[PDB]
Design goal:
The structure is cut from a larger assembly and holds 3 copies of chain A. Chain A is of the alpha/beta class. The first copy, chain A, has helices spanning about 15-30, 85-90, 90-95, 105-120, 145-155, 160, 185-190, and strands spanning about 40, 50-55, 65-75, 75-85, 140, 170-175, 195-200, 205-210, 215-230, 235-245, 255. Chain A is flat, with a radius of gyration of 24 Å. Chains A, B, C: Belongs to the encapsulin family. Family 1 subfamily.
Chain lengths: ~260, ~260, ~260
């Protein structure tokens, strides 16, 4: 909307359109957490807090009127800036097919780690708890290709004592996955037809259920690009967003110690 | 709605209808603050916080990604209980026209002071500031019937240096008003045709403008009555509500020191 | 119109609309002269002089061809600048209801004295004469509440020896009006049903007739706001206007000496 002052920057339609496509491609492969959690739809640029449904009592013991306060979670807002070069950007109109956009890509890669760190390890100043802190759901595994199958078979018998079902997914580390490569068809069918995700963000493995409604991400505004000011022969732009995160049912998650 | 468990109490329609009318009459004359402020419509039993439109920065000085948190005001919830007598309540069906309801009236009178205290003096634990703490809007007055007219004429020349207009109202203490009784027609027309409100809640006088949009009260749920449990030969009931308060433009208010 | 370069400033529609309303309110109460004089409609941004209907002869005494020049009044143009803060202005989109606009109000108050000074005391370099320089229309008054009524009754017998009639108005000083407060209904009906105006711009009183067509103010362009240039993190704006003033019939004015 209008709060991103896009019409006041000296660029053309083709130049604006060439900048969005490059960032949309990297955001699609570098956001690992968004592949197995739920997303609650956007509320707007004015939303500020999300309700927790409880009261805390502050009055004394022997009083006629008694009172307290309600509870909530506050959202987080971010902002990051970069700069580009005008004479280099202007060859697109003469007809050059490969213009150099190298400052955009480093910033796009650094913004993507900030969100995954909050999802996997919490914040401690906004009141958020991450996935790797629930230490009461753990089983010890070994380091031979048979132990992987044995641990996967043992993990589905704990989901049964509760009423948990649905498709199941494996999330594992990319250096560990190299030494288990000979057994790939066996795992997929022992998982009853699930899927595997490799990532550099953790050091061990975890198993989750995907029936729906256990891990949610709340958004106010999605990721956006805007204009700030002009310099000698460069231009200055920024990226922004607002969000928060929550875990509801901790019985759909299991950690593998290795 | 259903969260007040009214259908599970052993009473009839006439008995329920006779209890609401008595409280509705006292609430209409004992709520003094609601006669010159604005009321924002009810949102519901789940509303929890109201937005302040600002951000607070928490990151360090030299970083690539910078962040902060948004700001809000939390609401207040109250609850008060009382008890009544069944054999006495049952004479309404035999045809008695004056049944004794004496425990209801003390509780109704004590709930009404709690709200006026917040409006006139703040809370200090929810982050609320009341009307009598803005000390930069004050003028000294005297104690002779001419000084009242002189101070009222002086107070309308300060409203003019800003763009403030509209009808004006006087709020004064009831023991002070006794000694100014001979001049009543003069005040009403010197006020350009305003109105006067006497109250036991303060000790001096104040003047306010009533053009609209300067002092607001935000409600989640209005004042309601519900049922709790049964005892030997009595029944137990309660009253409840949720709210908060704000002052926007401090240039529509003036205090008279006397 | 287009000579105010409004489209080149980095603001939104709501931000522009919030700035006009605040100035429109103060201009409505701080322009005292415009309450009893006439206004001749606007001519445009190119108007330059207004005709006086006379000729001045410059040739010699014994010549066959004789000649001279015509006479006029030139208009006055003004300009005043101020600056504002962008991050503070940007909270209106997050939802803040009271944004601080403190530099605008001082400039608006200082522009309003400049016009009243010309109307009440003349210019001496454009050829303008003000209301307080016609010294042949004066009567001496006293300082007791009866002398006010006596002087008002005497002043209406001078309007009768000429053919002057119509409603009559009193313009008086605000510290003097305090000591005459007990007689207010008497004055209004002795004035035959007129009106009273209090002001801090003079030191005595005057009486004028309001039949129409004796004191006129000529405008080229009304009061307007425009954009100049951008700074580090602020923006710079200005206010402008063009006008002149004239008195036609000096027999509709009387001064009270006190
Ligand atoms: C032939 C020629 C073409 C140029 N084209 C551009 C251009 O497309 N964009 C640009 O910013 N500067 C261009 N410049 C340079 C630019 O005019 C100048 O060096 C700086 O903008 C400072 O005046 C060009 C210079 C020359 C000699
Ligand atoms: C003639 C009579 C009428 C009564 N009516 C009522 C009544 O309307 N409501 C009531 O709670 N108790 C009533 N009681 C008393 C009640 O039955 C009893 O004392 C207590 O409820 C304990 O059993 C009545 C008792 C008598 C003797
Ligand atoms: C979270 C955050 C939000 C900001 N929002 C704004 C803004 O709305 N307008 C603004 O001019 N500057 C804003 N700034 C600061 C701005 O980017 C920077 O300090 C100066 O504009 C110089 O780069 C913000 C900074 C942070 C950290």
């Amino acid at each position: 909307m209008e709060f991103l002052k896009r019409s006041f920057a000296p660029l053309t339609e083709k130049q604006w359109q060439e900048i969005d496509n490059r960032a949309r491609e990297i955001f699609k492969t570098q956001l690992y957490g968004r592949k197995f959690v739920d997303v609650e739809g956007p509320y707007g640029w004015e939303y500020a807090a999300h309700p927790l449904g409880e009261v805390e009592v502050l009055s004394d013991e022997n009083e006629v009127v008694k009172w307290g306060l309600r509870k909530s979670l506050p959202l987080i807002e971010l902002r990051a800036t970069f700069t580009l070069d005008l004479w280099e950007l202007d060859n697109l109109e003469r007809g050059k097919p490969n213009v150099d956009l190298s400052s955009l890509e480093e910033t796009v890669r650094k913004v993507a780690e900030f969100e995954d760190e909050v999802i996997f390890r919490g914040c401690e100043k906004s009141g958020v708890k991450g996935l790797l802190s629930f230490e009461e759901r753990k089983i010890e595994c070994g380091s031979t290709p048979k132990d992987l199958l044995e641990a996967i078979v043992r993990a589905l018998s704990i989901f049964s004592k509760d009423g948990i079902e649905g498709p199941y997914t494996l999330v594992i580390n990319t250096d560990r996955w190299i030494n288990f490569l000979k057994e790939e068809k066996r795992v997929e069918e022992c998982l009853r037809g699930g899927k595997i995700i490799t990532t550099p963000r953790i050091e061990d493995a975890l198993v989750v259920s995907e029936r729906g409604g256990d891990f949610k991400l709340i958004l106010g505004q999605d990721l956006s690009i805007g204009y700030e000011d002009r310099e000698k022969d460069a231009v200055r732009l920024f990226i922004t967003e607002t969000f928060t995160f929550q875990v509801v049912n901790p019985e759909a998650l299991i950690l593998l110690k290795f």
